[PDB]
């Protein structure tokens, strides 16, 4: 009975599909702006980057709001709000650029609150023994959502008007909120259709007694060198990721001169490669831990190096290659794929440094690392007004320099193990 297709896993498959919508509402514009150029606008990096001006605001308060309101209502209203605001995207564009900025900034105010709400919900819906599997199932939703949203947006823009994407995904989100509400409960005890049995989750949670003091010593937290190393490393990685996420379709259209359908397919190939590389790299890291006796810090630093320096090399190789179609696409795809190793880098490091105080450190390392989201598209769409090869190469060079600096900082300052300030 508790094998599959019932109870907890059901919740999982509602989050995964749900996250399939969520990240889509962030990745569709990068394709839609390719089709919408129809309006005339320059230095439109603000349009692409405003989504962060709300992501950074709501990244931290997510946990505090989820503790009181609860994961169900918080996540449901966040997704409903972002879907509704996506439904209003063409109207906001019609009114003007400023309305689009303010609408796409209110989006992201519901995007960032999703992860803390989901984490709070599975703080009670997920037994510790199988928590990793469920968390992986849910968080694969974001990657698969991007990977499927790019081709879908490209196809809809090629066969129909661009605005329909902001409709299509939007209604799906509403449909999600039209179903999730009557299939998910905040706590397992209050849930219906669970029926008898399935007391494994409650008994396991009660026996584990995962509740801690939660003293949140912010002063030692802000004076922890490995934490700042992780922050800088995630800053660099998010800079590269957001530059290659909000501007890749623009790069393909302006420079590679691909069609919209091609701009939707060959732009999704890199992220599909990254997701597959993540899946394989989890097992690769497990085998490296098992077969060879390597310290945790060494494993983290070598994975971070091989997953950041490599992206810098292949991204600077994306430039200097000219307008060659296949070679440039292959270099970009390999860059993102090789950056896929970073999953066994930063993230599974913040758990190592302080397992007890996880989440708070995750919030710190996410809020400081979305400044790249705000400043990357703006500074990258600027400095390339003429869409020349050299102008884009300058952006690629600065991204590679940021990655090299971040990798050196991380491998020189991260200490691993468990830090003193977080020990019972």
SS3 state of residue 118: helix
**Are 32 and 67 part of one and the same domain?**
yes
Tell me how far apart the alpha carbons of residues 415 and 300 are, in angstroms, rounded to a whole number. 10
SS3 state of residue 44: coil
**Are 43 and 139 part of one and the same domain?**
yes
**Are 199 and 220 part of one and the same domain?**
no
Tell me how far apart the alpha carbons of residues 245 and 242 are, in angstroms, rounded to a whole number. 5
The DSSP code sequence of 211-239 is: -------HHHHHT-HHHHHHHHHHHHHHH
For the four alpha carbons of 160, 163, 169 and 175, in that order, the dihedral sign comes to negative
Please choose, from the candidates 344, 351, 380, the residue with its C-alpha nearest in 3D space to the C-alpha of residue 365: 351
Q: Which of 184, 211, 238 lies at the terminal end of a domain, its last residue?
A: 211
Please choose, from the candidates 301, 267, 311, the residue with its C-alpha nearest in 3D space to the C-alpha of residue 150: 267
Which residues precede gaps in the chain, with C-N > 2.5 A?
Answer: 37
Q: Which of 211, 245, 260 lies at the terminal end of a domain, its last residue?
A: 211
**Are 207 and 222 part of one and the same domain?**
no
Q: Can you give the CATH number for the domain in which 298 is found?
A: 1.20.1250.20
**Are 63 and 128 part of one and the same domain?**
yes
Tell me how far apart the alpha carbons of residues 113 and 117 are, in angstroms, rounded to a whole number. 6
**Are 104 and 226 part of one and the same domain?**
no
For the four alpha carbons of 283, 286, 292 and 295, in that order, the dihedral sign comes to positive
Long-range contacts of 71-76 (CB under 8 A, 24+ apart): 71/117, 71/118, 71/120, 71/121, 71/122, 71/186, 72/121, 72/184, 72/185, 72/186, 73/186, 74/113, 74/116, 74/117, 74/120, 75/18, 75/113, 75/114, 75/117, 75/118, 75/121, 76/177, 76/180, 76/181
Q: Do 52 and 373 meet the contact criterion of CB atoms below 8 Å apart?
A: yes
Tell me how far apart the alpha carbons of residues 73 and 178 are, in angstroms, rounded to a whole number. 13
Write out the two tokens for 244: 């290659």
End-to-end CA distance of the chain: 38
**Are 140 and 243 part of one and the same domain?**
no
**Are 147 and 38 part of one and the same domain?**
yes
Torsion of CA 92, 374, 236, 327, to 10 degrees: 40
Instruction: Sort residue 354 into left (φ over 0), alpha (ψ -120 to 50) or beta.
Output: beta
Tell me how far apart the alpha carbons of residues 258 and 249 are, in angstroms, rounded to a whole number. 9
**Are 203 and 220 part of one and the same domain?**
no
Write out the two tokens for 100: 């689009």
Helices (H), 97-217: 97-106, 114-125, 131-159, 163-180, 200-208
Q: Do 364 and 217 meet the contact criterion of CB atoms below 8 Å apart?
A: no
Structural domain span for residue 92: 1-211
Sequence-distant (≥ 6) Cβ neighbours of residue 410 within 8 angstroms: 229, 230, 232, 233, 301, 304, 308, 345
What is the total count of domains within the chain? 2
Sequence-distant (≥ 6) Cβ neighbours of residue 292 within 8 angstroms: none
Please choose, from the candidates 331, 348, 342, 354, the residue with its C-alpha nearest in 3D space to the C-alpha of residue 236: 342
**Are 176 and 319 part of one and the same domain?**
no
**Are 270 and 370 part of one and the same domain?**
yes
To what resolution in angstroms was this structure determined? 3.4
**Are 197 and 236 part of one and the same domain?**
no
Q: Which of 211, 240, 275 lies at the terminal end of a domain, its last residue?
A: 211
Tell me how far apart the alpha carbons of residues 79 and 11 are, in angstroms, rounded to a whole number. 16
Tell me how far apart the alpha carbons of residues 408 and 331 are, in angstroms, rounded to a whole number. 23
Q: Do 398 and 56 meet the contact criterion of CB atoms below 8 Å apart?
A: no
Experimental method: cryo-EM
Q: Do 126 and 204 meet the contact criterion of CB atoms below 8 Å apart?
A: no
């Amino acid at each position: 009975a508790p094998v599959c297709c019932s109870a907890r896993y059901n919740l999982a498959i509602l989050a995964f599909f749900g996250f399939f919508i969520v990240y889509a509402l962030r990745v569709n514009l990068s394709v839609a702006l390719v089709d919408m150029v129809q309006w005339d606008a320059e230095t439109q990096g603000w349009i692409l980057g405003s989504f962060f001006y709300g992501y950074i605001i709501t990244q931290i308060p997510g946990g505090y709001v989820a503790s009181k309101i609860g994961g169900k209502m918080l996540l449901g209203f966040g997704i409903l709000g972002t879907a509704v605001l996506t439904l209003f995207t063409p109207i906001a564009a019609d009114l003007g650029v400023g309305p689009l900025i303010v609408l796409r900034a209110l989006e992201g105010l519901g995007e960032g609150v999703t992860f803390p709400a989901m984490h709070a919900m599975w703080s009670s819906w997920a037994p510790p023994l199988e928590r990793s599997k469920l968390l992986s199932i849910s968080y694969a939703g974001a990657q698969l959502g991007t990977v499927i949203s790019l081709p879908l947006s490209g196809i809809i823009c090629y066969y129909m008007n661009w605005t329909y994407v902001f409709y299509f995904f939007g209604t799906i989100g509403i449909f999600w909120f039209l179903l999730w509400i009557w299939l998910v409960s905040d706590t397992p005890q209050k849930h219906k259709r669970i029926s008898h049995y399935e007391k494994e989750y409650i008994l396991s949670s009660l026996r584990n007694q995962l509740s801690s003091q939660k003293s949140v010593p912010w002063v030692p937290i802000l004076k922890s060198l490995p934490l700042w190393a992780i922050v800088v490393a995630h800053f660099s990685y998010n800079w590269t990721f957001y530059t290659l996420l909000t501007l890749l379709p623009t790069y393909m259209k302006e420079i590679l001169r691909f069609n919209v359908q091609e701009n939707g397919f060959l732009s999704s190939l890199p992220y599909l490669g990254s997701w597959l590389c993540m899946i394989l790299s989890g097992q690769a890291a497990d085998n490296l831990r098992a077969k060879w006796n390597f310290s945790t810090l060494c494993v983290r630093r070598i994975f971070s190096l091989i997953g950041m320096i490599g992206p810098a090399v292949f991204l600077v190789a994306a430039g200097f290659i000219g307008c060659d179609y296949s070679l440039a696409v292959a270099f970009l795809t390999i860059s993102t794929t090789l950056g896929g190793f970073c999953s066994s880098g930063f993230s599974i490091n913040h758990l190592d440094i302080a397992p007890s105080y996880a989440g708070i450190l995750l919030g710190i390392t996410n809020t400081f690392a979305t400044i790249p989201g705000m400043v990357g598209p703006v500074i990258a769409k600027s400095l390339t007004p003429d869409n020349t090869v050299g102008e884009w190469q300058t952006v690629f060079y600065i991204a590679a320099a940021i990655n090299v600096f971040g990798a050196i900082f991380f491998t020189l300052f991260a200490k691993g193990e468990v830090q003193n300030w977080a020990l019972n």
